[PDB]
DNA sequence: CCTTCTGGGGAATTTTAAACCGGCGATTTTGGGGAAAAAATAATCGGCCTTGACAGCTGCACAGTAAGAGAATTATGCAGTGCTGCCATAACCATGAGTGATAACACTGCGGCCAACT
């Protein structure tokens, strides 16, 4: 989930000619992370999560 | 008057410094698996801050359009009646087939009789 700005910052770094690790250092993320983000379309900050159960669910209709 | 010393130059050789390229040893990095921790997201909890309402109640008036409710009128479909013709059914006889009936034995249902308890 790094940000617009951190994505930005990974792919401009790793195509101007900068070694991958010391990349993931500079940025504090793993190497791997870094390296999946580097053939990735577009920065990845969101996730989606639909609707849970909660406590007034059979009250519900009631009410 | 003569001899010896020295110096310059061209060629041959040697050594050391520098740079490249390859080989060898070390660290890094990528991938996968397992555990732990952090953070993010959603849900649930308590509580503070702020304000609306409760103060008789709302039914009516006018505007225009449309609908509808009741009564009178009209159209139409059903019904009723008479006369004639055609189709259906019914009546009889014959023959075949199905079912209700009859005999016999076995099992079960109903009515008459005896006994036990209150």
Redesign the pocket.
């Known amino acids: 989930?790094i940000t617009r700005g951190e994505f930005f910052m990974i792919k401009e770094m790793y195509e101007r000619g900068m070694?991958?690790?010391?990349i993931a250092r500079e940025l504090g993320i793993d190497?791997?992370t870094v390296?999946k983000y580097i053939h990735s379309p577009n920065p990845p900050s969101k996730?989606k999560?639909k609707?849970?159960k909660?406590?007034?669910d059979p009250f519900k209709p009631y009410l």
């Open positions: 989930m070694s991958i690790s010391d190497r791997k390296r996730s999560r609707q849970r909660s406590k007034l």
